[PDB]
């Protein structure tokens, strides 16, 4: 009976593909062809933050657009003041291998996970002024690749066991499990309305999950290799994914099909980080060729280039007000651009 | 208008002093990535260097501190977290030489994949041909033939530079150096002048694996320092 179910699955996939093809009556090549290009987005580094001994692998911007958290493989979580390059905090980690960090929307807490499969949450606003670990969420059987604070007392973590999880901080036990990915889930992005979230995995597939009810609401394919980054469009009705195939793709949730492709012939390095601008017109992507690119999301062209990193760019972020863009690479240096 | 930014600069200076103290220790120790598979004996080597001085094992030889990371409780798709070990000073690859079954081909393929990884082209590999007593017993028994899985072994001879332990059968040393040369062919196929392989013949009763690792790391650091001077 397994074979008949396989034919049922393949014919259902064929029907879905046919419906997607029918739903596409045009393409963005001629829809936005009458839009003036943004020209050249020339950006220069304003601040350079130093102090990490080993490579910086992830970062997250604050809600106030002032404070930063950066995680380095030496075992350090450093909170910087972007305006004055002042190190506000420096937290040592129990495990040197950290692969993600998140900053709470209220700014009270900071999270980090890694090869230890444990998400450690530290309370910054403590009574005695010394930062100590407040929670250790455990339960993933694979490396924790990305965490994003839904709010206080709730967090979403994607792991290397091909699963995502929504936890409860004070109880310490995960409340919801999102399964369906056949590969390593690499990135997360919370929707602006805080009701859905997209996760791209190491199977050339991304999935939109409903956090409240807890199952794969939608799925999207099109990439050629492992997806390494994902982020929601500011409108909340689209997202962008970068992969190891040296291409970026923009998907729309309502269209449920591939929408835009940002690629170049002379780019053969995978994308490690993806982020949007405040208006959503500029899609910023970090690459393995040691420099970041800035595409016009509506035109699919290189509107800007950020160079100055001596190693692969690993993390990339844009402020809530859009005023500055921070890039962290493997040369232990984090840069601010505006 | 120095009212509070003085306080944040004092906090910055304290943080910088703490970071300098931490850096004085971070690069004074060598981090090692232990790699292997099932029935390879890497856990026995771990307990060996732990009793006598992800999972972490700290040991110390000649007043030099070594941190060894044994990946555990992870899936079998290592194409992603292995990039976390691009700055490791050495990858200790342990392989059971008596598992030809024919598990030696898989070990060779993983060794080739590690050697050819673009994020590990600068990290040297210390090779541990573990379980030499089992290989000797298997060769002396004669029930299993190496040429069954590696036909070219039928046309292989002992290298001239071989230094067998006295009292060893020519057959067992032939097989031992054949496995070593099988690994060394992949080692020398690519990656010239930037990382090297350090094969060794270890076993469970062996007791100088720690000194072997120390010597190999010493050689790696010396070669790196000489290369920085454009002198080697």
């Amino acid at each position: 009976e397994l074979d008949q179910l396989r034919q049922e699955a393949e014919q259902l996939k064929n029907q879905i593909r046919d419906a997607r093809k029918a739903c596409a009556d045009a393409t963005l090549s001629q829809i936005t062809n009458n839009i003036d290009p943004v020209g050249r987005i020339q950006m220069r580094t304003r601040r350079t933050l130093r102090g990490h001994l080993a490579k910086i692998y992830a970062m997250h911007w604050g809600t106030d657009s002032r404070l930063l958290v950066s995680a380095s493989q030496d075992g350090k979580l450093i909170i910087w003041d972007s305006y004055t390059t002042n190190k506000v905090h420096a937290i040592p980690l129990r495990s040197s291998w950290v692969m993600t960090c998140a900053y709470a929307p209220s700014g009270n807490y900071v999270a980090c996970g890694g090869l230890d499969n444990i998400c450690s949450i530290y309370n910054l606003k403590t009574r005695e002024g010394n930062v100590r670990v407040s929670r250790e969420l455990a339960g993933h059987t694979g490396y924790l690749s990305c965490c994003r604070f839904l709010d206080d007392n709730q967090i979403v973590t994607s792991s290397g066991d091909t699963t995502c999880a929504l936890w409860d901080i004070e109880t310490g036990q995960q409340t919801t499990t999102f399964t369906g990915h056949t590969g390593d889930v690499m990135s997360l992005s919370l929707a602006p309305d805080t009701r859905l979230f997209v996760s791209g995995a190491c199977d050339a597939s991304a999935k939109l999950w409903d956090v409240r009810e807890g199952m794969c609401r939608q799925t999207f394919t099109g990439h050629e290799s492992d997806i390494n980054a994902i982020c929601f469009f500011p409108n909340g009705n689209a997202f962008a994914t970068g992969s190891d195939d040296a291409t970026c793709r923009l998907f729309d949730l309502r269209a449920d099909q591939e929408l835009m492709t940002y690629s170049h012939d002379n780019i053969i390095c995978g994308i490690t980080s993806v982020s949007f601008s405040k208006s959503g017109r500029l899609l910023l992507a970090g690459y393995d060729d040691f420099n970041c690119n800035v595409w016009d999301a509506l035109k699919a062209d290189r509107a800007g280039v950020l160079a100055g990193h001596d190693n692969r760019v690993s993390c990339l972020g844009v402020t809530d007000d859009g005023m500055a863009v921070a890039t962290g690479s493997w040369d232990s240096f984090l840069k601010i651009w505006n | 208008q120095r009212n509070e930014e003085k306080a944040q600069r004092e906090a910055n200076k304290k943080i910088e002093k703490q970071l300098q103290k931490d850096k004085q220790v971070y690069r004074a120790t060598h981090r090692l990535l232990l790699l292997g598979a099932g029935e390879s004996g890497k856990n026995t080597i771990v307990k060996q260097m732990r009793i006598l001085h992800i999972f972490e094992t700290k040991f110390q030889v000649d007043k030099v501190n070594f941190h060894m990371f044994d990946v555990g409780a992870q899936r079998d798709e290592r194409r992603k977290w292995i990039q976390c070990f691009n700055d490791v000073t050495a990858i200790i690859f342990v392989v059971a030489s008596s598992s030809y079954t024919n598990r030696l081909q898989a070990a060779l393929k993983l060794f080739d994949s590690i050697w050819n990884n673009k994020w590990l082209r600068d990290t040297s590999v210390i090779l541990f041909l573990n379980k030499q007593d089992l290989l000797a017993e298997k060769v002396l028994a004669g029930k299993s033939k190496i040429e069954d899985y590696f036909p070219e072994f039928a046309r292989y001879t002992t290298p001239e530079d071989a230094t067998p332990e006295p009292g060893e059968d020519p057959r067992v040393t032939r097989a031992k150096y054949f496995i070593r040369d099988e690994f060394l062919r992949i080692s020398t196929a690519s990656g010239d002048g930037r990382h090297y392989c350090y094969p060794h013949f270890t076993c469970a009763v062996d007791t100088e694996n720690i000194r072997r690792v120390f010597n190999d790391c010493r050689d790696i650091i010396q070669r790196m320092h000489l290369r920085q001077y454009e002198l080697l």
Partner: nanobody
Amino acid sequence: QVQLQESGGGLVQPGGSLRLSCAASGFTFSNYKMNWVRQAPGKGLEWVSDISQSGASISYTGSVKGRFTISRDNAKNTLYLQMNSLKPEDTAVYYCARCPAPFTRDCFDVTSTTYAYRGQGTQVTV
């Protein structure tokens, strides 16, 4: 949608020959590395052979060296495995696999248990 479909299996007497075809869709074929793996009774995934982008560099496992031939045609987006002089221990499910990264020499996790870019495989029994 990455897709790899295998065909050409079946039952053959010992000493026979077979041809296994592997059709790829959803991605460019010439920008990465192909390979053939197999899974036999006595559960375990073993690497059989591999071929690079252009097809100049080909490598075989010791057991089938001198017995199997591998080829790739980027024009037709296909891979071929020619099997000569079959032996009783060659009965297995053959998977046409490929490691993900384009333009790379390393090739990870092809023989993994739950690989994503591996085909459904075809039965070869003798």
